[PDB]
Design a binder for this molecule. Structure first.
Ligand SMILES: Cc1cc2nc3c(=O)[nH]c(=O)nc-3n(C[C@H](O)[C@@H](O)[C@H](O)COP(=O)(O)OP(=O)(O)OC[C@H]3O[C@@H](n4cnc5c(N)ncnc54)[C@H](O)[C@@H]3O)c2cc1C
Ligand SMILES: Cc1cc2nc3c(=O)[nH]c(=O)nc-3n(C[C@H](O)[C@@H](O)[C@H](O)COP(=O)(O)OP(=O)(O)OC[C@H]3O[C@@H](n4cnc5c(N)ncnc54)[C@H](O)[C@@H]3O)c2cc1C
Ligand SMILES: Cc1cc2nc3c(=O)[nH]c(=O)nc-3n(C[C@H](O)[C@@H](O)[C@H](O)COP(=O)(O)OP(=O)(O)OC[C@H]3O[C@@H](n4cnc5c(N)ncnc54)[C@H](O)[C@@H]3O)c2cc1C
Lengths: 566, 563, 566
């Protein structure tokens, strides 16, 4: 064989890497040990960043067609059982109108719900169509790096044959027990994630629309706490509880109990179990090897950051491998992938873990031990309807405990969006880091300073709304300015012809192709009309100039050469 | 010939009074000079207060049918012509996502567009169906007050007969030239406007969906004439601040910018406003409301809305006094509570006008261009120069500032603050508005404020705090630890002969603080209570269920009723 | 390697075969020469039979999510150009209310529009998930049959390796130049399909919603006639015209002309060409080899019968291979696949061709030659607005010509649905063949006589509508009767235990699981309440008894043994 990039793993990080590279005309071979895309729904939250990526490569409309929408997700119920009495609800996934506004303001895209079961084949099939080579039932074994590329060994689970593939780079997208990460010798940290613990799932099928229609939610959590998650509303489900476990048809009895009733016909599907050693890689890159996805960040599902961060890892790297492979960028461009993605890997493992500690106080508020007998809980239900002042303090205590769980259920908007990149890939503009005015995990803060994601606002094109994001992306640098910065067009042209690099310039303003109709661009840009922002193929601002002066203009070339390592 | 209340006027203010009175079992006679309801679309913005009133009387679901919802109203375009180039847009009627959150947090109800052409008949039929006698083609001529009621003289425009009506009260809802306001001798304070001039409106049909559907707005202003939607997107009205031929379709063709679409000119009418508010709305047995007491500009569309709210304030009061449950002094809070609103909404409506000249100044246009000055300005606006960018920034600033009259005045719409004998103070100081009080609603539970909206649940279904309340009766809201309120309410209800529904909100209860938003908005302890008037306003707040706290309910209610 | 069934080809016939077999627990290996599912939209009509199959294996809801619906398809415009003047319209795809009723009455499912581009990966991904082995970049070469199975040779386009796979059967789903059909020596007929002719496609992207919104159609045909087909409304398209052809950016000029205007921005995508030798196989089976799809019927797109007939070939065979592979059926069960599917192969090639002849009379009515100059056509437009009686006869002539094209554009409901099976697989009940009361190509006729598809009507289950079809299918024979035929339950039980075969019985009636609420079952069944219908895994009736008499009961066993070849 022979390819430019061997992509080991076909899950979200791998499927997305192959699609982006193929879109960029890079030859890739993605492999996967198993028969299919993944049997389980697993990962189901899709945050705005991953829906932006889908938008940029034209797959958002598909994603949206197969995905429950945000209006079905909001009602997070805490209760005894599905048919029993609620303790309370919380506005999950930004359903609170203030949350929703903060959400809608931050991006053109929105939260949906799309199980991995569906997400994966949609991306794998697209990578193949875009020209990536894809090959399942192929079980990576190892590799040997030399100065000019790599030579890993493959075991073919159909033929029984074994073979070699010569590449230039290897992406290790191979999941939570990355053999690619072991062989590249990646150091891992923060392993003290509370005694290694798993969870046990249990798919089933029942029409509980009579218990869900009037209160539409992504999830329904019973107090040992067990979650009822909607695969498809409202006939498909899955029960979770915190735990190699075995269960029979006796799981049907657990479900009925969870439903609080035994009179909807149930149909028990597959039963899996999950385990996690919570860790992150301190570095994600070794020589020609680059790991991503679960391969470098392993954690709890709290916040559903994994799949989303996994795809964003792929979006960071792809255009960089493509530029280097084409000789338009030095290989040192590739150093920033660790510089930018590794701090995201630690932050999300740490955040996902920290959310687990928001749940014991729910039990403490009701004066219930870690594990409560049925008489114990039934008594806590009684204490809670007590007409005394102590019953008040108690109802207030539970409300406060419940509210605090939201950080893990749609409240971490800051965590999802607040990426801040420091690297060679990002040319600093001399301004100091401004801060987050509000808590940076809870609330997103838009920034146009180099290192931040391009902020969303609406422009219009033909009197139709277009996002600032839809101007950019597509495996090509974009320069945004206004009428008074007309010189940018020429400066960009010189820089692009000389550096052999595509750089689209958009002069936003009246009578232009794109118009700052609502004035929201002037508002969000942080700089004069004549200033420019340079936006990387991955939506991040890498260069910012305040005006169109000669010294501002002269600096574009220095920044692009610097970004490219030339 | 004999009724308890004679309502003069069948516009929004009159029809609403009749409907509420009738709903309350009070005999009324509502009259109207003309043949029909108003044939003009006129006022169309329905704010949340009016939609709340509609919901309370079960008419919310109806209006909404015949309503254009908020999603169609947002895109306010400023342009040269409809098919020409936009200068820019502003997010009108709370369409900016932050405005929208503030809007939706403030109420169960939402902005809609429902022309008065449709609103009126919807309410006049309900007034008639609910028990009210209604009788158009009948002109109020004058009346004479005496000690026991009033005698009007009516002029039947079908018979030529003239007769008398005896009534215990008279509502003057007879519009911008109230004769009822003149004869009652109500004082008016000016004095805004130079001098007292009107506008011209032009109805017309035309299929304009191809210029409106990708940019859904309530309104499209051209540089100043407004092109306002009646029905999306085929029915219309062209306004601008006489005599006009039917062949003024020209002016329309040019305002919409093309002439390729068939246009069918309907009626052409003129509106003249003399900006004034009554200092007092009440004289003896005469109570004025609507345009009769506040005459003003359409900036902000506060006028139909504040006109209905006048009716919602007065009705349950007339009914309680007519029933003898309440003393006649209870009526005194009508002027104390509604007159300050009447001066506030004229002044506000007028002040918005002055946000428009700065648009022309940004354009460096003369107050009124001529010809190629309006073409030249556009060129300056596209100027690559640094002064051109100052011009664009200046144009943007001027535009943004017009929002105060186009959905921005949420505070104005909602921040009612009543001080009177019908509001029983709880001893706390007036909290301030943390933010600007014209732009931003501030929720309050302090007596004199409207009951705050938040969502509880009933049968795991969302219900608003507002739905528990009103319905022509006083409501007391408390929590589980406030169990005693309900005995106390029962004792107060028998001793005074007045309905007081008590709702104990909590787990296991009929209504549940499912999201905990009530504990959060309440402001008091779970065992505190809030008393809400039939008109959704809080008149008594207790901080807990202590014996001192319990004891005060009966003093408050007696005090609210004048007894 | 080693599998029970080697499936050569991964298009609709192959992807559907692998999904059904995997659903039935049969080990399959499906291969495909190329990188991906097919780049082109191609096949886009989905008729009711293929939407029934999708329903039965639980993929209809997916199919429906990614598919334009019938309400967008109806307006078939004939015109000069898209922005020019229409000649007239016809109610395509059963949009006429009478057509629509006949349509809705015939099935629980409906016409949609779903390009192959999307349909294929949705089925391939499902086959893999259901446990079929799938392997692209694998290029069948040949095989050698012996008495116990087959041994074909494979060429691996990733490794360069070659290898053998031992199977029991081979399905030849390998398209219009079936190497599997050549090697099995299948005779082909009806090749005189008018001098071999092709067509030339031309994908593009433009927002012509302003010309389409008000008249929603699947297609817009210009008069050389060139068709504007909607890939996605209304931004995606493709231009066709009847023709190895080459075109440049000069195709953009053809498009603009077809649009009649050059002011919507266009974006020219890929340009392919199609060619067809119209033929059908006289037999589809040779020893252990079974061909299906284009492999046995090659034809024009008129009526869009290919993809739909292709999938139905797979649905006929799968459950038969599974029963034989499990030893519950003799191998002679497999003889009926040719007996039932081959007459469908000839009928559809012949029908698809015959539709082409409905188009010249449109040109003849307007007195235009085969190929008309621009002055010629412009003159025909003039003649057509002539205020004379000869202008009348002429407008009437064109209306009649246009109406007659509908047989190829949604009018052939009889062709789509009127399958009549005669074979060992179908146990005859002694009644004569009743006939079609109306034209059997135009109008569907429901039949419960053995050999016909189970008729659709609505029952209810929990007061919810359920189709008679939803009772049946699932790789298991089903027996439908009513309360007075209670004996069927026991007779079925004896027959099933002794024959080692699953046979679900449904006793439809009041107070039962399924209820003849509307009485439409009594109406459609053609037999007493106590009669039974036996329905094959593929929805076809194989046995019909008129009542529950002892002789009726005694015959079930004879029929099932006979169907199974035992
Ligand atoms: C059982 C389970 C349940 C989960 N539930 C949730 C949940 O409820 N919520 C949530 O937020 N997250 C959940 N997750 C986490 C989740 O599925 C992801 O984080 C995501 O799938 C990981 O992305 P990758 O693309 O980074 O991982 P992967 O999807 O695991 O991709 C790894 C790929 O590499 C392949 N591979 C591995 N080794 C080799 C090899 N040696 N050679 C060739 N191929 C190889 C694998 O087969 C696979 O194709 C769950 C994970 C699992 C396993
Ligand atoms: C032509 C016109 C256009 C308008 N356009 C707008 C607009 O675009 N936007 C906006 O916000 N507001 C607009 N308004 C303001 C508006 O219609 C209201 O503020 C509202 O109608 C006033 O309510 P009332 O119910 O208070 O007034 P009215 O609707 O005028 O009700 C008065 C009633 O009393 C009756 N009446 C009067 N005299 C007698 C009598 N002597 N005897 C018996 N009955 C009598 C009248 O016939 C009428 O039925 C417009 C008003 C007019 C006249
Ligand atoms: C370019 C084109 C345009 C078309 N347009 C239309 C249209 O507009 N309307 C319409 O109704 N129909 C159209 N069709 C017809 C259509 O696409 C089908 O009838 C259908 O795809 C055929 O089903 P199969 O599943 O029977 O065929 P195929 O989709 O062709 O499946 C054949 C499969 O076998 C593979 N294969 C072939 N040989 C080998 C081998 N030696 N080894 C391994 N694998 C092999 C192929 O790669 C492919 O995966 C078009 C066809 C083509 C080719």
């Amino acid at each position: 064989a022979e390819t430019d990039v061997l992509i080991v793993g076909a899950g979200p990080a791998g499927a997305m890497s192959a699609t982006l590279l193929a879109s960029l005309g890079i030859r890739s071979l993605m492999i996967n040990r198993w028969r299919s895309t993944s049997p389980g729904p697993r990962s189901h939250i899709i945050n705005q960043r991953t829906m932006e990526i889908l938008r940029d490569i034209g797959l958002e409309e598909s994603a949206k067609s197969l995905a429950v929408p945000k209006e079905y997700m909001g009602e997070h119920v805490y209760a005894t059982s599905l048919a029993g009495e609620e303790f309370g609800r919380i506005p999950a996934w930004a359903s609170h109108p203030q949350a929703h506004a903060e959400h809608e303001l931050a991006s053109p895209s929105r939260y949906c719900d799309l199980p991995q079961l569906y997400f994966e084949p949609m991306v794998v099939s697209e990578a193949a169509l875009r020209g990536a080579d894809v090959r399942f039932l192929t079980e990576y074994l190892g590799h040997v790096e030399d100065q000019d590329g790599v030579t890993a060994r493959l075991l073919d689970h159909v033929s029984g044959a074994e073979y070699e593939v010569r590449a230039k780079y290897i992406i290790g997208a191979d999941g939570a027990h990355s053999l690619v990460a072991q062989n590249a010798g990646l150091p891992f940290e923060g392993q003290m994630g509370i005694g290694d613990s798993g969870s046990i799932n249990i798919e089933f099928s029942a029409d509980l629309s009579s218990l869900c229609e009037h209160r539409k939610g992504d999830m329904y959590w019973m107090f040992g706490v067990a979650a009822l998650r909607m695969i498809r509303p409202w006939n498909k489900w899955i029960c979770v509880w915190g735990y190699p476990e075995i269960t029979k048809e006796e799981a049907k009895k657990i479900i009925h109990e969870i439903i609080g009733t035994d009179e909807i016909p149930v149909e028990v599907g597959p039963i899996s179990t999950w385990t996690i050693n919570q860790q992150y890689a301190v570095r994600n890159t070794s020589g020609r090897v680059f790991c991503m996805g679960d391969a470098v960040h392993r954690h709890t599902p709290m916040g559903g950051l994994g799949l989303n961060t996994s795809v964003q890892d792929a979006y960071n790297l792809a255009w960089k491998l493509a530029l280097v492979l084409k000789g338009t960028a030095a290989p040192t461009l590739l150093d920033s992938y660790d510089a930018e993605r590794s701090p995201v890997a630690k932050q999300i493992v740490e955040r996902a873990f920290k959310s687990l500690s928001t749940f014991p106080p729910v039990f403490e508020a009701l004066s219930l031990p870690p594990a409560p007998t049925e008489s114990e809980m039934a008594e806590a239900l009684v204490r809670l309807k007590d007409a005394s002042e102590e019953g008040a303090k108690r109802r207030a205590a539970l409300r406060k405990a419940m509210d605090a769980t939201i950080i893990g259920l749609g409240g971490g908007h800051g965590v999802e969006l607040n990426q801040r990149y420091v690297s060679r890939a990002v040319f600093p503009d001399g301004t100091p880091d401004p801060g987050f005015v509000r808590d940076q995990e809870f609330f997103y803060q838009a920034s146009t300073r180099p290192g931040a994601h391009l902020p969303h606002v609406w422009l219009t094109e033909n009197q139709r709304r277009i996002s600032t994001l839809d101007l950019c992306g597509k495996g090509r640098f974009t320069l945004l300015t206004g009428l008074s910065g007309a010189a940018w067009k020429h400066e960009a042209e010189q820089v692009s012809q000389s550096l052999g690099i595509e750089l689209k310039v958009c002069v936003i303003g009246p009578g232009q192709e794109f118009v700052d109709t609502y004035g929201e661009y002037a508002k969000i840009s942080e700089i004069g009309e004549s200033g420019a922002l340079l936006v990387r193929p991955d939506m991040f601002i890498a260069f910012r100039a305040k005006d169109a002066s000669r010294e501002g203009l002269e600096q574009l070339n220095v920044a692009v050469k610097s970004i490219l390592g030339r």
